[PDB]
Symmetry: C2
Subunit: 190 residues, 2 copies
């Protein structure tokens, strides 16, 4: 357990009615057995992006375009979410979802190698990452140069390694791991 | 020990990632423990700092602040062109904060006042970050008085949201406010975050 099950149950009870887009995506994930960002985590992503007001958000790997949806909902047309996934299915699901909901205008989607393609970006304001898929150390070796001044690294599934300690021991980042969902590491570039 | 929030094992791990402690902060904890004053724990203060850095506020208002602990975290996160306005009825709180801030020089961007926290806070305008302690104030009441003082897209940060310094009244209220986007992060005693929609 990350947080007491009674606390988690309570926080869920306080939730508003779900967005049918999110409810629909949660069904597809469930059946295709695709892991996706839980709802408390997605809400945090949305909050963070609204506060941060990023111009560029990069998402290397995104099951059903789930993270991309939370981020897209948070930015205006003057900004962009760039999503890359190696599975054409995740990309086509995401595309249809964003198109249908009037957000495709601010989201760039590509089928391919996530970090391979993501590294072509510059001045990234928010870099999203899934610890279940990539090792932070590997990610930063290839992406640190793509980060904007005061960029925010958001790493999900951070609690459930060497990376959590490392990012917490370097002068160029202010890092904290919040116990939301499966743990979310937030690394702010100083 | 009280209402449990983060698993003890997880808590220990997160604490193990904490960097070497600032003696300023360490000096403040003990003083808090001797004057029996509740203060923001380190994981919580670090979250405050991070949120403030990404928010980039011009004005942060802290109505009520034991030993100036909250103001200390916020002061460190803002520019010389910005301000933290701290109000507390106790002269010892205000003086403790003045000293720390004078000592680190950040007194240059912090306004400290001895008085009624809400009475004085209510005179502020275009507040970017409004800090709040759920143990001391009825959130709904604070917001009914202060919403008018908030800047576009202000952020509300309410501590002791899940347990006393789980869950309480302001959580139920704020979650229903269609004018805010809210979430509760279960760090420390729980932290309620409310973003004021455009
Ligand atoms: Cl580049
Ligand atoms: Cl610290």
């Amino acid at each position: 357990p990350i947080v007491d099950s009674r606390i988690g149950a309570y926080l869920d009870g306080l939730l508003p009615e779900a967005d049918p887009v999110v409810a629909a995506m949660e069904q597809i994930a469930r059946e295709r057995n695709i892991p996706i960002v839980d709802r408390q985590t997605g809400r945090l992503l949305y909050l963070l992006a609204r506060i941060k007001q990023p111009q560029l958000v990069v998402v290397p790997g995104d099951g059903l375009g789930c993270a991309s949806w939370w981020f897209a909902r948070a930015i205006s047309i003057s900004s962009r979410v760039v999503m890359i996934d190696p599975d054409r299915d995740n990309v086509e699901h995401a595309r249809r979802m964003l198109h249908d909901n009037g957000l495709i205008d601010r989201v760039e989607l590509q089928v391919g190698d996530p970090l391979g393609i993501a590294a072509g970006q510059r001045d990234i304001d928010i870099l999203f990452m899934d610890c279940d898929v990539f090792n932070g150390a590997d990610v930063l070796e290839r992406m640190n140069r793509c980060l904007a001044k005061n960029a925010l690294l958001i790493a999900v599934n951070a609690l459930r390694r060497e990376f959590n300690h490392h990012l917490s021991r370097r002068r160029d980042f202010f890092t904290t791991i919040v116990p939301v969902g499966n743990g979310v590491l937030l690394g702010y570039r100083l």
